[PDB]
Amino acid sequence: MIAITGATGQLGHYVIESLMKTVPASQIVAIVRNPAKAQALAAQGITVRQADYGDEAALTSALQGVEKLLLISSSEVGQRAPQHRNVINAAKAAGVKFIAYTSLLHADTSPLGLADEHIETEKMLADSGIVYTLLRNGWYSENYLASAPAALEHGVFIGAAGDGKIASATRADYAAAAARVISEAGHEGKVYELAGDSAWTLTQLAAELTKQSGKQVTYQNLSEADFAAALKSVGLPDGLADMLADSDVGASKGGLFDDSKTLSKLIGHPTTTLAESVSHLFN
Ligand SMILES: NC(=O)C1=CN([C@@H]2O[C@H](COP(=O)(O)OP(=O)(O)OC[C@H]3O[C@@H](n4cnc5c(N)ncnc54)[C@@H](OP(=O)(O)O)[C@@H]3O)[C@@H](O)[C@H]2O)C=CC1
Ligand SMILES: [Cu+2]
């Protein structure tokens, strides 16, 4: 029996659809905090167990019978470690035999500040005494593409990534990889550096963006301080602008680049290209 946290999130939703191609709904257990948002999962045969992430006891009850657990990291970036602390201890007590975790590409060496909470979580895993696998996801192409409209309307794309190379991949790609790891054998104890088969600069993004839209789009490389202040300028939560600007700087440092091709070789086919993703904007 396999269990999965964050099943109601964008990545998890895909993990589940992916898993359901080869796994009977019943053999899947979605540990969610709010079953109200688990409408779809219920309408598929998937088991849903409620568990407050800040509640180890509830997490332990929720992990009963679970042989393999996918810990889709928490989106509550800021108090994530304590949450994953609870989850890992619940698993130990419940007797989970295998845990796969979504971390960050090259976590231990990444220049991005987002690596922090993941590193703490990777340590706890090392400490758990439970066999585990690190699914170090690189950047979701859908992140930058979230600013596709703003760049199309206002004419240009901005950031602080310089010439850094982002080997992005879709959420569906990473979810498939997570799906294989938790369902198929031969993927325990591994440290997978998952990323796109290709990489691209923010400028290649603008050029690709103008090539398909027709309208012009230039890339304006700003400094970190600039970029940050730039987001809040159009009214953006400080935390966000900060993290966002830090990540771009982490990318300018090559922290989002990897060319191991672990992702495609793992999902058994080529990862989704930026060209195809960009295409969706005009689906
Ligand atoms: N490598 C990369 O490029 C990126 C990595 N990420 C991170 O990767 C993970 C996956 O992505 P995605 O689906 O897009 O993110 P989402 O925000 O869509 O998914 C978040 C999930 O974690 C759960 N969760 C968060 N807080 C709690 C809590 N206190 N108790 C129980 N569950 C909680 C569920 O929340 P709910 O019910 O509210 O849906 C939710 O499904 C995320 O958790 C996120 O932190 C995010 C963007 C980019
Ligand atoms: Cu497509």
Side-chain angles (χ1 to χ4, degrees), residues 177 180 184 187 192-197 260-264 266-271:
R180 259 58 141 197
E184 289 155 49
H187 304 296
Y192 293 134
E193 294 296 345
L194 310 160
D197 287 321
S260 68
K261 291 189 177 178
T262 309
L263 229 197
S264 58
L266 187 58
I267 54 180
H269 50 84
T271 53

Side-chain angles (χ1 to χ4, degrees), residues 141-152 154-162 164-165:
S141 302
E142 303 93 305
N143 299 325
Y144 288 116
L145 275 28
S147 300
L152 272 43
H154 304 317
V156 290
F157 195 111
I158 59 176
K165 302 190 294 184

Side-chain angles (χ1 to χ4, degrees), residues 5-13 31-34 51-52 54 72-75 77 83 102-105 114 118 137-140 143 171 174:
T5 72
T8 50
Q10 308 196 69
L11 179 76
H13 164 239
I31 301 180
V32 306
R33 52 174 171 180
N34 172 45
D52 177 290
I72 291 179
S73 53
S74 173
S75 50
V77 56
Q83 293 174 177
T102 59
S103 190
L104 177 66
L105 188 63
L114 276 188
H118 284 114
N137 298 329
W139 229 235
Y140 293 163
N143 299 325
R171 279 199 179 66
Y174 295 111

Side-chain angles (χ1 to χ4, degrees), residues 272 276-277 279-280:
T272 310
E276 160 74 298
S277 293
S279 181
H280 278 301

Side-chain angles (χ1 to χ4, degrees), residues 203-214 216-219 221-232 234-235 237-264 266:
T203 296
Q204 289 182 299
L205 170 62
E208 178 60 40
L209 221 48
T210 149
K211 177 179 185 177
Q212 287 191 50
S213 81
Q216 192 73 187
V217 174
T218 286
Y219 171 58
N221 189 197
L222 312 166
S223 73
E224 196 187 337
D226 283 319
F227 186 41
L231 306 181
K232 294 161 291 182
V234 183
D238 274 60
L240 271 175
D242 287 349
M243 175 256 102
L244 275 177
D246 172 273
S247 295
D248 274 53
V249 172
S252 74
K253 301 192 176 186
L256 287 192
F257 178 69
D258 173 274
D259 76 314
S260 68
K261 291 189 177 178
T262 309
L263 229 197
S264 58
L266 187 58

Side-chain angles (χ1 to χ4, degrees), residues 7-36 38-40 42-52 54-73:
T8 50
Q10 308 196 69
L11 179 76
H13 164 239
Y14 284 129
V15 181
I16 294 180
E17 287 187 303
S18 180
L19 287 172
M20 291 242 55
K21 297 197 187 309
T22 63
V23 181
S26 59
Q27 203 59 55
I28 301 174
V29 170
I31 301 180
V32 306
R33 52 174 171 180
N34 172 45
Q39 270 281 189
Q44 306 182 60
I46 286 68
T47 293
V48 188
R49 292 181 182 169
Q50 192 282 160
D52 177 290
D55 188 313
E56 193 187 315
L59 285 164
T60 305
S61 297
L63 284 168
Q64 187 288 137
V66 179
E67 181 187 54
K68 299 145 69 183
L69 156 64
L70 172 57
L71 177 49
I72 291 179
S73 53

